Design a protein around this ligand. Structure first.
Ligand SMILES: OC[C@H]1O[C@@H](O[C@H]2[C@H](O)[C@@H](O)[C@H](O[C@H]3[C@H](O)[C@@H](O)[C@H](O[C@H]4[C@H](O)[C@@H](O)[C@H](O)O[C@@H]4CO)O[C@@H]3CO)O[C@@H]2CO)[C@H](O)[C@@H](O)[C@@H]1O
Ligand SMILES: OC[C@H]1O[C@@H](O[C@H]2[C@H](O)[C@@H](O)[C@H](O[C@H]3[C@H](O)[C@@H](O)[C@H](O[C@H]4[C@H](O)[C@@H](O)[C@H](O)O[C@@H]4CO)O[C@@H]3CO)O[C@@H]2CO)[C@H](O)[C@@H](O)[C@@H]1O
Ligand code: NAG
Ligand code: CO
Ligand code: CO
Length: 434
């Protein structure tokens, strides 16, 4: 796709701290850009939509190539249309924003410049951020994570994409998303099947795969940390069901692990660590600091801070595994206890290390789940299982919670606020900000 300018594109600024092993941190100034899927896609020479509701223009878009040639992405009114605002080192995303149309959440990328994404090399470093999940009930997810996307959003590899990072193109993740309207400079109209429950979405014949470091998938009820490996580290197109993931009938596709080696304290047995109010170690009605460290061995460590009090990731005993570090032994023990082989089949932490050794783009979003109602995160899943089934219970939400239409109607004013992002060598982000 190309870019049009009927609506100006002004990325909301966002500062973050870059810290050094020497004990100091200096401010960095970037901004955030919304993913292409949320934008208006119209004919290059008029205001005629190329995509409207959940269907493509059969005339402007008879095939993937003709569509990309005829269509462009336009600018976004961040606040009024998408409920996205920033203030210094803070970013807030509203759940439901009503303007000419209804919008649900957003997926944003941290940019280095107005035309490029900021890349982060995680291995040997740590990522810290503050988050207020107090306004996120069951069924919602204010996610913060990393994906192996190209800094230009795909422009150099696919000439037919001239919109680039400035218009949020180039997305990929471990689900090998087939819901994307443009992948590799081409539309995804061929094979498009509209969603039966979502008026704005569908699933195309192609998907976009890549490694994903799911640092934070959470709401006020549950939270998870999950690395997802892929046989090919960076962004790569996939065909139909071979894509696997949430959008295909067979989730175990040929390149990415859609499950991951997840770590949810509640799922592991500690039901008193994270939740709303004073009866939990971490009170989700108040802001908290989340720190994730990526040691060179390939293992992942984590600690939290609230009201100045520090808490390492709680210990978990699973099979022969015991501890609080997300390592090979943990992931192997989890598959043995909870079942599955997806993570190890895709190479595990060794394969995942190949992604953290290279650059990854920061993603911040707010979304509800049209495929599983966020049950895999905050409830019992599958819903027919009981607490006796190892790993079934991941949170205290009812198995009837999270229906998109219901949560959007009942909690339209829900929101998530990410702030004070700090990145640097392990042991440095706790030092004074510049
Ligand atoms: O039609 C001419 C008219 O266009 C106006 O611009 C509209 C676009 O017409 C309309 O297609 C566009 O719709 C967006 C919508 O705002 C987003 O909320 C929505 O986001 C979805 C996304 O589609 C999904 O892929 C994702 O999973 O979830 C998100 C969140 O729900 O995406 C649709 C497009 O698919 O909105 C534009 C702004 O109102 C012009 O403003 C007007 O001048 C023209 O006359
Ligand atoms: O397009 C909408 C929205 O998508 C967001 O991406 C989400 C997907 O929408 C969501 O389906 C996906 O959820 C995965 C989850 O990551 C896995 O860890 C989980 O694995 C389960 C497994 O399914 C169970 O069988 C097993 O028992 O437990 C494991 C562990 O819980 O499976 C679910 C469903 O496939 O997560 C994606 C993010 O990682 C985008 O982030 C957002 O921007 C979009 O708007
Ligand atoms: C949960 O974790 C916290 C922090 O590590 C710990 O103090 C508490 O005892 C744990 N509770 C349970 C039930 O494991
Ligand atoms: Co093809
Ligand atoms: Co270690």
């Amino acid at each position: 796709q190309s870019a049009c300018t009927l609506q100006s594109e002004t990325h909301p600024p966002l500062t973050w701290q870059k810290c050094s092993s020497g004990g100091t941190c200096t401010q960095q100034t970037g901004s955030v850009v919304i993913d292409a899927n949320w934008r208006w896609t119209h004919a290059t020479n008029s205001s005629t939509n190329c995509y409207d509701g959940n269907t493509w223009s059969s005339t402007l878009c008879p095939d993937n190539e003709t569509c990309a040639k005829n269509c462009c992405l336009d600018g976004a009114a961040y606040a009024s249309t998408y409920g996205v605002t920033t203030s210094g080192n803070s970013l807030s995303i509203d759940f439901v924003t009503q303007s000419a149309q209804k919008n649900v959440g957003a997926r944003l990328y941290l940019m280095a410049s107005d035309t490029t994404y900021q890349e982060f090399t995680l291995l040997g470093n740590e990522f810290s951020f503050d988050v207020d999940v107090s306004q996120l009930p069951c069924g919602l997810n204010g996610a913060l994570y990393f994906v192996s996307m190209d800094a230009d959003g795909g422009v150099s590899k696919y000439p037919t994409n001239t919109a680039g990072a400035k218009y949020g193109t180039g997305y990929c993740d471990s689900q090998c998303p087939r819901d994307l309207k443009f992948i590799n400079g081409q539309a995804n109209v061929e094979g498009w099947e509209p969603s039966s429950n979502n008026a704005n979405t569908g699933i195309g014949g192609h998907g976009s795969c890549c490694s994903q470091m799911d640092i934070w998938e959470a709401n006020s009820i549950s939270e998870a940390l999950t690395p997802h490996p892929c046989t090919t580290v960076g962004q790569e197109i996939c065909e139909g069901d071979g894509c696997g993931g949430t959008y295909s009938d067979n989730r175990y596709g040929g390149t990415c692990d859609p499950d991951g080696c997840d770590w949810n304290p509640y799922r592991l047995g500690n039901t008193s660590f994270y939740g709303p109010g004073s009866s939990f170690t971490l009170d989700t009605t108040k802001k908290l600091t989340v720190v994730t460290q990526f040691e060179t061995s390939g293992a992942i460590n984590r600690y939290y801070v609230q009201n100045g009090v520090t808490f390492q990731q709680p210990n978990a005993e699973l099979g022969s595994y015991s501890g609080n570090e997300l390592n090979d032994d943990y992931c192997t023990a989890e598959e043995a206890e909870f079942g599955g082989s997806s993570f190890s089949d895709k190479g595990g932490l060794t394969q995942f290390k190949k992604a953290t050794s290279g650059g990854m783009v920061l993603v911040m979003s707010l979304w509800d789940d049209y495929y599983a109602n966020m049950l895999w995160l905050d409830s019992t899943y599958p819903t027919n299982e009981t607490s006796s089934t190892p790993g079934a219970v991941r949170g205290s939400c009812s198995t009837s919670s999270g229906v998109p239409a219901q949560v959007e109607s009942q909690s339209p004013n829900a929101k998530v606020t990410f702030s004070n992002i700090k990145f640097g060598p392990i042991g440095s982000t706790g030092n004074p900000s510049g």
